[PDB]
Amino acid sequence: EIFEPPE
Amino acid sequence: IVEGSDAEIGMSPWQVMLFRKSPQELLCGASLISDRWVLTAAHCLLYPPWDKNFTENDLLVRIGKHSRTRYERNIEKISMLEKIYIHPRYNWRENLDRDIALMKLKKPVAFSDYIHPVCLPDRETAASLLQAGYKGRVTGWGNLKETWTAGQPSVLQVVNLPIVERPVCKDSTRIRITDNMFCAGYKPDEGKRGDACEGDSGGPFVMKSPFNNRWYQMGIVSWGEGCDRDGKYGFYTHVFRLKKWIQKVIDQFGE
Amino acid sequence: EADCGLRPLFEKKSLEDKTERELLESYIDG
Ligand SMILES: *C[C@@](*)(O)[C@H](CCCNC(N)=[NH2+])NC(=O)[C@@H]1CCCN1C(=O)[C@H](N)Cc1ccccc1
Ligand SMILES: *[C@@H]1O[C@H](CO)[C@@H](O)[C@H](O)[C@H]1NC(C)=O
Ligand SMILES: [Cl-]
Ligand SMILES: [Cl-]
Ligand SMILES: [Cl-]
Ligand code: NA
Ligand code: NA
Ligand code: NA
């Protein structure tokens, strides 16, 4: 799907 | 993983996610074997019939994860790669014989509750545990059902499966099997089900030693035909068989 | 490596996961 970004 | 269940948190703290930087994509699984070294399947990095040839700069590894897609703050660690090493006799043309690669991280990763290396087997361990009917465990964020069968888990999946004897593996497929592979999974008449699948490649097949209470990685998820089919079995790279290559690489290129 | 294979949230705490007994059973039972 969609990956959550860092931080 | 097909017909498995959600992993418990910290159940598989050596599980690694291979992640393509751009575009963002889960490529495969992997395993942590020391603070600088990750083990995976070579076909995850190099598979020229599908134009796959990743360099170090194309990839990241994500360690200590549970959720497939969330960024697990203060739990996961992201590492860059110093160098990829592929078995020089990996056969992508025929049967994925020696489907094994190592990746050296740029910097050592700090261990934690969620991040911790798996053991590699010594001869005695492999001999004691590599027996038909003995079960190992397979983990991964790969497909929940056979490809085209239409899909992805929310969290890491886990299934326990029995090692199957060579003649059964051999007669199960027309792909040419080698001693650098083994297969696992239930026979039709055993009733129970479960298999690794696409996207689980490179993740560990692990067994818990009753001699010392430690988890050992005996296998790498490598290949199969469909997933969880009656009369088919998942195939794994035989880690102890390739241990002399593993040691050679780490000895030469380690710190 | 020295400490490999012992999981901080399980072996290191004398806790067992939900399905590890299934593995051991397969190694002992007929
Ligand atoms: C790269 C992976 O994630 C994946 C693992 C599949 C595991 N399946 C089951 N049921 N346990 N491996 C592959 O997709 C490999 C890469 C090349 C194609 N392949 C296959 O498994 C094919 N489905 C069969 C095959 C083709 C050519 C050579 C060997 C096997
Ligand atoms: C893969 O990439 C490297 C350089 O990035 C190259 O040397 C190698 O020949 C490439 N192609 C194949 C098919 O291996
Ligand atoms: Cl890094
Ligand atoms: Cl098919
Ligand atoms: Cl090192
Ligand atoms: Na590569
Ligand atoms: Na099957
Ligand atoms: Na138990």
Tab-separated table of C-alpha atoms and ligand atoms in Angstrom:
chain	number	residue	atom	x	y	z
A	1	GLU	CA	0.000	0.000	0.000
A	2	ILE	CA	1.480	3.210	1.440
A	3	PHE	CA	4.562	3.192	3.745
A	4	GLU	CA	4.713	5.611	6.659
A	5	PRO	CA	7.854	7.774	6.434
A	6	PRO	CA	10.596	8.100	9.165
A	7	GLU	CA	11.214	10.029	11.771
B	1	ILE	CA	2.887	-16.449	4.741
B	2	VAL	CA	-0.225	-18.528	3.945
B	3	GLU	CA	-2.289	-20.009	6.826
B	4	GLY	CA	-0.031	-18.679	9.587
B	5	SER	CA	-0.847	-16.223	12.337
B	6	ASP	CA	0.258	-12.848	13.696
B	7	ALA	CA	3.670	-12.963	15.372
B	8	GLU	CA	3.974	-11.952	18.966
B	9	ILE	CA	5.982	-8.833	19.521
B	10	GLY	CA	9.731	-9.728	19.780
B	11	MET	CA	9.027	-13.325	18.744
B	12	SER	CA	11.493	-13.018	15.838
B	13	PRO	CA	13.908	-10.189	16.720
B	14	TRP	CA	16.330	-11.313	13.923
B	15	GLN	CA	13.672	-10.634	11.226
B	16	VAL	CA	14.851	-8.078	8.684
B	17	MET	CA	12.936	-6.263	5.963
B	18	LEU	CA	14.679	-5.553	2.717
B	19	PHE	CA	13.231	-2.239	1.457
B	20	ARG	CA	13.725	-0.591	-1.951
B	21	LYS	CA	14.520	3.127	-1.416
B	22	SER	CA	12.892	4.547	-4.515
B	23	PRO	CA	10.196	3.693	-5.402
B	24	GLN	CA	9.396	2.574	-1.811
B	25	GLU	CA	8.732	-1.185	-1.815
B	26	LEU	CA	9.067	-4.228	0.460
B	27	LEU	CA	11.327	-6.495	-1.533
B	28	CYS	CA	11.794	-9.528	0.694
B	29	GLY	CA	12.784	-10.740	4.095
B	30	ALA	CA	16.266	-11.236	5.605
B	31	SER	CA	17.782	-12.178	8.913
B	32	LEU	CA	20.266	-10.587	11.286
B	33	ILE	CA	23.253	-12.808	12.099
B	34	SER	CA	25.607	-10.332	13.861
B	35	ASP	CA	25.781	-6.569	14.376
B	36	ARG	CA	27.097	-5.942	10.825
B	37	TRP	CA	25.738	-8.840	8.790
B	38	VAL	CA	22.346	-9.701	7.303
B	39	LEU	CA	21.585	-12.855	5.525
B	40	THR	CA	19.063	-13.127	2.608
B	41	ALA	CA	18.207	-14.978	-0.616
B	42	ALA	CA	20.283	-14.087	-3.654
B	43	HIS	CA	17.189	-13.927	-5.927
B	44	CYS	CA	16.028	-10.968	-3.829
B	45	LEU	CA	19.088	-9.023	-5.214
B	46	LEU	CA	19.878	-10.616	-8.501
B	47	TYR	CA	17.463	-12.201	-10.899
B	48	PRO	CA	18.195	-11.208	-14.424
B	49	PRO	CA	15.164	-12.778	-16.176
B	50	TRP	CA	13.096	-10.102	-14.339
B	51	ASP	CA	15.797	-7.384	-14.764
B	52	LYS	CA	16.610	-7.443	-11.082
B	53	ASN	CA	20.122	-6.392	-10.138
B	54	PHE	CA	20.102	-4.175	-6.964
B	55	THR	CA	23.289	-2.404	-5.815
B	56	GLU	CA	24.060	-1.345	-2.234
B	57	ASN	CA	22.745	2.151	-2.862
B	58	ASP	CA	19.354	0.891	-4.089
B	59	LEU	CA	18.337	-0.680	-0.779
B	60	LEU	CA	17.814	-0.274	2.925
B	61	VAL	CA	17.257	-2.757	5.674
B	62	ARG	CA	14.627	-2.244	8.375
B	63	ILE	CA	15.293	-4.160	11.580
B	64	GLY	CA	13.118	-4.742	14.703
B	65	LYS	CA	9.844	-4.365	12.777
B	66	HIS	CA	6.348	-5.806	13.456
B	67	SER	CA	3.927	-3.684	11.341
B	68	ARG	CA	4.460	-4.154	7.571
B	69	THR	CA	3.806	-0.507	6.655
B	70	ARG	CA	4.005	1.704	9.820
B	71	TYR	CA	7.200	3.467	10.847
B	72	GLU	CA	7.802	1.992	14.237
B	73	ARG	CA	9.437	4.955	16.051
B	74	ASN	CA	12.046	4.010	18.718
B	75	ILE	CA	11.499	0.342	17.887
B	76	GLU	CA	12.761	-0.250	14.290
B	77	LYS	CA	16.239	0.679	12.984
B	78	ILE	CA	17.032	1.646	9.453
B	79	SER	CA	20.443	0.585	8.107
B	80	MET	CA	22.217	1.374	4.852
B	81	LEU	CA	24.394	-1.220	3.082
B	82	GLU	CA	28.138	-1.101	2.704
B	83	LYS	CA	28.345	-4.040	0.353
B	84	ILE	CA	26.329	-6.943	-1.086
B	85	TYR	CA	27.895	-10.389	-1.500
B	86	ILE	CA	26.213	-13.038	-3.689
B	87	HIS	CA	27.165	-16.706	-3.791
B	88	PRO	CA	29.433	-16.997	-6.797
B	89	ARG	CA	27.677	-20.276	-7.780
B	90	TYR	CA	24.114	-19.047	-7.333
B	91	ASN	CA	22.296	-20.546	-10.330
B	92	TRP	CA	19.454	-18.177	-11.332
B	93	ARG	CA	19.239	-19.814	-14.832
B	94	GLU	CA	17.907	-23.186	-13.640
B	95	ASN	CA	16.771	-23.961	-10.079
B	96	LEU	CA	18.022	-21.197	-7.700
B	97	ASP	CA	20.672	-23.483	-6.350
B	98	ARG	CA	22.708	-21.641	-3.664
B	99	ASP	CA	20.169	-18.926	-3.432
B	100	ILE	CA	22.083	-17.056	-0.754
B	101	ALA	CA	23.555	-13.521	-0.283
B	102	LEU	CA	25.048	-11.576	2.553
B	103	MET	CA	24.847	-7.827	3.071
B	104	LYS	CA	27.272	-5.896	5.190
B	105	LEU	CA	25.785	-2.884	6.929
B	106	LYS	CA	27.440	0.496	6.834
B	107	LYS	CA	27.460	0.721	10.591
B	108	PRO	CA	26.846	-1.863	13.314
B	109	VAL	CA	23.279	-1.987	14.591
B	110	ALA	CA	22.680	-1.778	18.376
B	111	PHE	CA	20.778	-4.725	19.832
B	112	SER	CA	17.524	-4.204	21.725
B	113	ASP	CA	14.330	-6.045	22.836
B	114	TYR	CA	13.243	-6.031	19.284
B	115	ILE	CA	16.572	-6.555	17.543
B	116	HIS	CA	18.847	-9.518	18.169
B	117	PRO	CA	20.825	-11.936	16.048
B	118	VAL	CA	19.880	-15.589	15.265
B	119	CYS	CA	22.502	-18.435	15.569
B	120	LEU	CA	23.858	-20.248	12.613
B	121	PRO	CA	24.027	-24.060	13.010
B	122	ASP	CA	27.147	-26.078	13.724
B	123	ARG	CA	27.405	-29.639	12.361
B	124	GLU	CA	25.966	-31.317	15.499
B	125	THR	CA	22.964	-28.992	15.566
B	126	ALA	CA	22.182	-29.514	11.882
B	127	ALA	CA	22.460	-33.246	12.277
B	128	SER	CA	20.311	-33.440	15.402
B	129	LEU	CA	17.544	-31.168	14.030
B	130	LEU	CA	17.380	-31.726	10.244
B	131	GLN	CA	15.036	-34.719	10.352
B	132	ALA	CA	11.785	-35.465	8.604
B	133	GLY	CA	8.778	-34.467	10.649
B	134	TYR	CA	10.810	-32.077	12.831
B	135	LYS	CA	9.330	-28.647	12.674
B	136	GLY	CA	10.770	-25.212	12.103
B	137	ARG	CA	9.256	-21.772	12.004
B	138	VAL	CA	8.985	-19.375	9.044
B	139	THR	CA	8.248	-15.644	9.291
B	140	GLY	CA	7.554	-12.954	6.767
B	141	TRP	CA	5.390	-10.094	5.458
B	142	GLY	CA	4.781	-11.862	2.097
B	143	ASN	CA	1.427	-12.727	0.459
B	144	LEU	CA	-1.406	-14.233	2.551
B	145	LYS	CA	-2.653	-16.292	-0.422
B	146	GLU	CA	-1.254	-17.758	-3.597
B	147	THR	CA	-0.148	-15.210	-6.189
B	148	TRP	CA	-2.898	-14.356	-8.740
B	149	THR	CA	-5.333	-15.802	-6.181
B	150	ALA	CA	-6.306	-12.349	-4.835
B	151	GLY	CA	-3.475	-10.126	0.091
B	152	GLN	CA	-0.838	-8.496	2.353
B	153	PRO	CA	-0.565	-8.848	6.129
B	154	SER	CA	-0.863	-5.925	8.564
B	155	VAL	CA	1.860	-7.393	10.821
B	156	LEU	CA	4.610	-9.967	10.573
B	157	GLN	CA	3.234	-13.534	9.972
B	158	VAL	CA	4.512	-16.812	11.501
B	159	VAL	CA	3.849	-20.461	10.638
B	160	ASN	CA	5.403	-23.672	12.008
B	161	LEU	CA	6.050	-26.437	9.426
B	162	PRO	CA	7.582	-29.945	9.367
B	163	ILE	CA	10.761	-30.816	7.359
B	164	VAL	CA	9.780	-33.282	4.603
B	165	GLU	CA	12.012	-36.239	3.469
B	166	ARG	CA	14.054	-35.740	0.242
B	167	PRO	CA	12.167	-38.307	-1.979
B	168	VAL	CA	8.846	-36.590	-1.225
B	169	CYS	CA	10.374	-33.145	-2.078
B	170	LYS	CA	11.985	-34.531	-5.239
B	171	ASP	CA	8.735	-36.174	-6.455
B	172	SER	CA	6.706	-33.020	-5.679
B	173	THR	CA	8.198	-30.889	-8.502
B	174	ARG	CA	9.853	-31.066	-11.891
B	175	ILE	CA	12.335	-28.336	-10.830
B	176	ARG	CA	15.740	-30.052	-10.217
B	177	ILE	CA	16.387	-30.137	-6.422
B	178	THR	CA	19.920	-30.053	-4.944
B	179	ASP	CA	21.398	-30.874	-1.557
B	180	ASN	CA	21.704	-27.050	-0.970
B	181	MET	CA	17.871	-27.009	-0.608
B	182	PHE	CA	15.336	-28.717	1.657
B	183	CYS	CA	11.549	-28.577	1.726
B	184	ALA	CA	8.957	-28.209	4.403
B	185	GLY	CA	5.179	-28.249	4.890
B	186	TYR	CA	2.324	-30.619	5.598
B	187	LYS	CA	1.357	-33.589	3.456
B	188	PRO	CA	-2.247	-33.678	2.174
B	189	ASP	CA	-3.203	-36.508	4.570
B	190	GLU	CA	-1.863	-34.596	7.625
B	191	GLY	CA	-4.725	-32.107	7.281
B	192	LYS	CA	-2.965	-28.967	8.623
B	193	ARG	CA	-1.755	-26.263	6.162
B	194	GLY	CA	0.789	-23.456	5.823
B	195	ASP	CA	3.498	-22.232	3.487
B	196	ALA	CA	5.729	-19.283	2.800
B	197	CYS	CA	4.867	-17.304	-0.352
B	198	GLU	CA	5.979	-14.536	-2.668
B	199	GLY	CA	7.611	-11.726	-0.776
B	200	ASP	CA	8.673	-14.091	2.073
B	201	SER	CA	11.957	-14.951	0.301
B	202	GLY	CA	15.167	-14.374	2.265
B	203	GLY	CA	13.340	-14.747	5.642
B	204	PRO	CA	14.513	-17.406	8.088
B	205	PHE	CA	13.405	-21.007	8.647
B	206	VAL	CA	14.375	-21.355	12.360
B	207	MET	CA	14.453	-24.270	14.866
B	208	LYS	CA	14.829	-23.998	18.721
B	209	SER	CA	17.623	-26.246	19.977
B	210	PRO	CA	16.616	-28.284	23.064
B	211	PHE	CA	20.389	-28.670	23.816
B	212	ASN	CA	20.926	-24.972	24.600
B	213	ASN	CA	17.577	-23.179	24.279
B	214	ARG	CA	18.822	-21.059	21.245
B	215	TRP	CA	17.186	-20.363	17.950
B	216	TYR	CA	19.151	-21.468	14.876
B	217	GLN	CA	18.544	-20.470	11.295
B	218	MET	CA	18.492	-23.788	9.278
B	219	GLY	CA	16.883	-22.380	6.125
B	220	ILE	CA	16.304	-19.432	3.881
B	221	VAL	CA	12.831	-19.048	2.184
B	222	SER	CA	13.812	-19.589	-1.492
B	223	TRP	CA	11.113	-20.868	-3.781
B	224	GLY	CA	7.994	-22.877	-4.484
B	225	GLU	CA	5.155	-23.335	-6.945
B	226	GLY	CA	2.019	-21.445	-5.956
B	227	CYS	CA	1.648	-21.363	-2.184
B	228	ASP	CA	0.014	-23.853	0.179
B	229	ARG	CA	-1.002	-26.184	-2.656
B	230	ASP	CA	-1.885	-29.756	-1.746
B	231	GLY	CA	1.084	-31.935	-2.658
B	232	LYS	CA	3.484	-28.947	-2.995
B	233	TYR	CA	6.153	-27.944	-0.435
B	234	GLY	CA	8.088	-24.729	0.122
B	235	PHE	CA	11.789	-24.849	-0.609
B	236	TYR	CA	14.514	-23.371	1.524
B	237	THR	CA	18.251	-22.737	1.083
B	238	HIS	CA	20.142	-25.206	3.343
B	239	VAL	CA	22.184	-22.817	5.512
B	240	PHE	CA	24.509	-25.311	7.194
B	241	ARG	CA	25.383	-26.637	3.746
B	242	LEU	CA	26.576	-23.130	2.695
B	243	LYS	CA	28.138	-22.232	6.052
B	244	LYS	CA	31.747	-22.445	4.732
B	245	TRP	CA	30.872	-19.782	2.147
B	246	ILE	CA	29.189	-17.634	4.792
B	247	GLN	CA	32.266	-17.864	7.100
B	248	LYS	CA	34.689	-17.149	4.260
B	249	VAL	CA	32.878	-13.872	3.401
B	250	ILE	CA	32.588	-12.658	6.984
B	251	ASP	CA	36.223	-13.563	7.741
B	252	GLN	CA	37.514	-11.650	4.709
B	253	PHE	CA	35.211	-8.622	4.726
B	254	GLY	CA	34.225	-8.212	8.402
B	255	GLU	CA	35.707	-5.761	10.953
C	1	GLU	CA	27.986	-14.962	17.937
C	2	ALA	CA	28.123	-15.105	21.768
C	3	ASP	CA	24.573	-14.221	22.580
C	4	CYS	CA	22.797	-15.331	19.412
C	5	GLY	CA	19.395	-16.985	19.453
C	6	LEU	CA	18.182	-16.015	22.927
C	7	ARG	CA	15.324	-13.527	22.546
C	8	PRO	CA	15.245	-10.643	24.925
C	9	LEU	CA	11.446	-10.873	25.443
C	10	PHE	CA	11.275	-14.666	25.698
C	11	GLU	CA	14.280	-16.854	26.626
C	12	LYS	CA	15.978	-13.996	28.396
C	13	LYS	CA	12.836	-13.592	30.552
C	14	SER	CA	11.963	-17.315	31.042
C	15	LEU	CA	8.851	-16.741	28.931
C	16	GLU	CA	7.670	-19.007	26.093
C	17	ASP	CA	5.898	-17.889	22.940
C	18	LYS	CA	2.471	-19.424	22.034
C	19	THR	CA	3.634	-22.076	19.547
C	20	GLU	CA	7.237	-22.938	20.402
C	21	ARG	CA	6.059	-26.082	22.333
C	22	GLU	CA	4.734	-27.381	18.953
C	23	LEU	CA	8.341	-27.429	17.683
C	24	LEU	CA	9.662	-29.304	20.711
C	25	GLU	CA	6.770	-31.771	20.534
C	26	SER	CA	7.772	-32.562	16.955
C	27	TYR	CA	11.345	-33.309	18.047
C	28	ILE	CA	10.313	-35.662	20.894
C	29	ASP	CA	6.980	-37.296	20.025
C	30	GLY	CA	6.833	-40.475	17.916
D	1	LIG	C1	11.686	-14.254	-4.126
D	1	LIG	C2	10.599	-14.860	-3.254
D	1	LIG	O1	10.087	-14.133	-2.403
D	1	LIG	C3	9.983	-16.212	-3.629
D	1	LIG	C4	9.604	-17.215	-2.557
D	1	LIG	C5	8.472	-18.120	-3.048
D	1	LIG	C6	8.107	-19.049	-1.875
D	1	LIG	N1	6.976	-19.915	-2.253
D	1	LIG	C7	6.517	-20.925	-1.496
D	1	LIG	N2	5.342	-21.511	-1.867
D	1	LIG	N3	7.126	-21.371	-0.435
D	1	LIG	N4	10.811	-17.018	-4.535
D	1	LIG	C8	10.502	-16.911	-5.999
D	1	LIG	O2	9.488	-16.325	-6.394
D	1	LIG	C9	11.444	-17.615	-6.952
D	1	LIG	C10	12.274	-16.580	-7.759
D	1	LIG	C11	12.329	-17.187	-9.191
D	1	LIG	C12	10.943	-17.773	-9.338
D	1	LIG	N5	10.663	-18.328	-7.982
D	1	LIG	C13	9.746	-19.278	-7.691
D	1	LIG	O3	9.487	-19.660	-6.523
D	1	LIG	C14	8.917	-19.839	-8.850
D	1	LIG	N6	7.458	-19.785	-8.425
D	1	LIG	C15	9.384	-21.258	-9.158
D	1	LIG	C16	10.838	-21.342	-9.643
D	1	LIG	C17	11.191	-20.867	-10.912
D	1	LIG	C18	12.520	-20.893	-11.372
D	1	LIG	C19	13.565	-21.417	-10.558
D	1	LIG	C20	13.233	-21.929	-9.258
D	1	LIG	C21	11.870	-21.863	-8.824
D	2	LIG	C1	24.741	-5.972	-12.041
D	2	LIG	O1	25.295	-4.736	-11.587
D	2	LIG	C2	26.732	-4.647	-11.535
D	2	LIG	C3	27.131	-3.179	-11.340
D	2	LIG	O2	26.083	-2.456	-10.727
D	2	LIG	C4	27.438	-5.233	-12.789
D	2	LIG	O3	28.849	-5.356	-12.625
D	2	LIG	C5	26.810	-6.565	-13.238
D	2	LIG	O4	27.443	-7.074	-14.404
D	2	LIG	C6	25.315	-6.262	-13.434
D	2	LIG	N1	24.497	-7.165	-14.266
D	2	LIG	C7	24.329	-8.480	-14.119
D	2	LIG	C8	23.417	-9.142	-15.108
D	2	LIG	O5	24.878	-9.134	-13.235
D	3	CL	CL	23.785	2.453	8.400
D	4	CL	CL	2.298	-22.711	-11.230
D	5	CL	CL	31.947	-7.660	11.226
D	6	NA	NA	22.810	-7.201	-6.682
D	7	NA	NA	1.293	-27.975	0.594
D	8	NA	NA	5.170	-23.349	25.985
